[PDB]
Structure formats: C-alpha cells, structure tokens
C-alpha atoms as one frame of an Amber mdcrd trajectory, in Angstrom:
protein
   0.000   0.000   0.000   2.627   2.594   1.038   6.675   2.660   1.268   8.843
   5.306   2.583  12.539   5.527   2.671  15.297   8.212   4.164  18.355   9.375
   1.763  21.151  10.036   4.171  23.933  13.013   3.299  27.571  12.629   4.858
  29.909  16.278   4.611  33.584  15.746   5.754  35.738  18.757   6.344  39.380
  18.766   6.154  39.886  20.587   9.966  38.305  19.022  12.352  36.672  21.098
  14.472  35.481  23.487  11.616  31.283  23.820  11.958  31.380  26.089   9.069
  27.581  24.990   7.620  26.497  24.007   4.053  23.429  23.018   2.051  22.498
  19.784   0.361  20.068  19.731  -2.291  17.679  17.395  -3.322  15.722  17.575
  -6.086  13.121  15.122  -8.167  13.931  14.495 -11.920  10.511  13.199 -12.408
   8.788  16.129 -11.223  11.794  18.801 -12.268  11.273  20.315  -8.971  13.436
  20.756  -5.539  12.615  18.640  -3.404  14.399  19.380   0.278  17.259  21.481
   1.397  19.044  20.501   4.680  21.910  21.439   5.804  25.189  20.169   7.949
  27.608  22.174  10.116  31.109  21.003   9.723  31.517  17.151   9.449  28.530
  15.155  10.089  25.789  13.415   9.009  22.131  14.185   7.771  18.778  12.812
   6.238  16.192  14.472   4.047  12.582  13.931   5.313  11.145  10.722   4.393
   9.770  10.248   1.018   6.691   8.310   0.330   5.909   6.029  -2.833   2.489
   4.010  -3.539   2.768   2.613  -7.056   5.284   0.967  -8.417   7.934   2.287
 -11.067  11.470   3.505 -10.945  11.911   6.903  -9.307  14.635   9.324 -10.107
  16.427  12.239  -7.693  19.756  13.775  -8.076  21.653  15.120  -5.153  23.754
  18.289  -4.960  26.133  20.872  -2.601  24.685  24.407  -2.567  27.512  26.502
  -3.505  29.550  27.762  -0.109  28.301  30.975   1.444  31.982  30.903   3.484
  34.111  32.445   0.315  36.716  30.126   2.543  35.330  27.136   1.233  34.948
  25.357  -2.051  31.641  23.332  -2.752  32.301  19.842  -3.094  30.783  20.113
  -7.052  30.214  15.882  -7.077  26.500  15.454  -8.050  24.952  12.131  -6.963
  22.057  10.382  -8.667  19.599   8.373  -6.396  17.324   5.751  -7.850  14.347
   4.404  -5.940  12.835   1.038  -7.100   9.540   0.315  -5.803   8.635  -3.222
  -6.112   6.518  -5.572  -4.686   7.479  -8.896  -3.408   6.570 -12.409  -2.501
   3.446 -11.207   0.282   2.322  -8.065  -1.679   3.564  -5.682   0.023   5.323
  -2.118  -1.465   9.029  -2.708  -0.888  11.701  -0.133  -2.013  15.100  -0.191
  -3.076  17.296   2.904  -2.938  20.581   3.101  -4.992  22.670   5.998  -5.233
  25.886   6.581  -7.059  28.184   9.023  -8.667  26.355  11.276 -11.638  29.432
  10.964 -13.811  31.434   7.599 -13.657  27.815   5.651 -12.282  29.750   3.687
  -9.257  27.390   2.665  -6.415  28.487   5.362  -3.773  27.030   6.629  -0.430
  26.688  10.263  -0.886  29.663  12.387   0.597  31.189  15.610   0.317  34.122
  16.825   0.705  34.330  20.527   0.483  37.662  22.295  -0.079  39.718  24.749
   2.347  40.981  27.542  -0.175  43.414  28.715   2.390  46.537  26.172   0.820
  49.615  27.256  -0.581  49.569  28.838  -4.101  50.383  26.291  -7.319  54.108
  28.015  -7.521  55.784  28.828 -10.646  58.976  28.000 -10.122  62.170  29.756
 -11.493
C-alpha cells in the first residue's frame, strides 16, 4: 500500500573542528522540482525527510552541494544520482530499493562531500 525511505547526506571537512555549515540539495527528476534542502555544520551526518511512494515504477532524484556561502570554502561540485525502485514482493507488500551513485562515472556510492579549504599554498611557478 505505502513505502517510505530516508536518503542520508555525509559532509567531511578537512579541519576538524570546523562547523562552518552548508546546504544539500535534493531535487526530483521526475517532477523537475526541488525537493528538500538541509543542511550540515562542519563534518557530520544528515537525512532528508522521508519520502513516500504508492505505485510501483522507478523513481529518479539527483543530489547536490549548494555553492559555499563561506568564500573560505569550495563546494564539493560531485552530483549524486539516487534511484528508488519500488517493487513488490513475494506477500504483496510495497518494498523499495534505494541506490545511489556518482552522476558521472555511475559507481554505487554513499553520498559524501568533501568541500575544499581555499586557504593552501599557491600552485608556484617556479624559477
């Protein structure tokens, strides 16, 4: 009858102790629309609210880094692609499967990011 499932967002930063915040994006292909922001402070861990499915078909989302409002920081710029299968099974009931992976090479991959410190030393030209 009804299935829900939870995509789950991990941000690392390079200094621990670092809260500086950023946004994660996700947004439906099937509708074209955004779906949920959220957003993590320094290295953690988050979910966008549960998304609910009652027929079955293959469901598409892609998931993105808001550019960095800390002019610090680079926005990790990987984009993720989440697929959703909903199935049902051997007793009938609305079962999902939720894959997500990298949008360019297509490897099954938790989504991560990795945002970059800018303050490094300057790519030298040497003499």
């Amino acid at each position: 009858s009804t299935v829900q499932t939870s995509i789950s967002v991990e941000n690392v930063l390079e200094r621990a102790g670092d809260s500086t915040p950023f946004s994660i994006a996700l947004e439906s292909i099937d509708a074209m629309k955004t779906i949920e922001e959220i957003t993590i402070a320094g290295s953690g861990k988050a979910s966008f609210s549960p998304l609910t499915f009652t027929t079955v078909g293959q469901y598409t989302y892609r998931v993105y880094q808001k550019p960095s409002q800390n002019k610090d920081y680079q926005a990790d710029t990987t984009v993720f692609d989440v697929l959703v299968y909903v199935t049902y099974d051997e007793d009938g009931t609305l079962v999902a499967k939720v894959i997500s992976r990298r949008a360019g090479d297509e490897e099954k991959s938790a989504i991560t990011f990795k945002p970059k410190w800018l303050v490094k030393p300057i790519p030298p030209r040497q003499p």
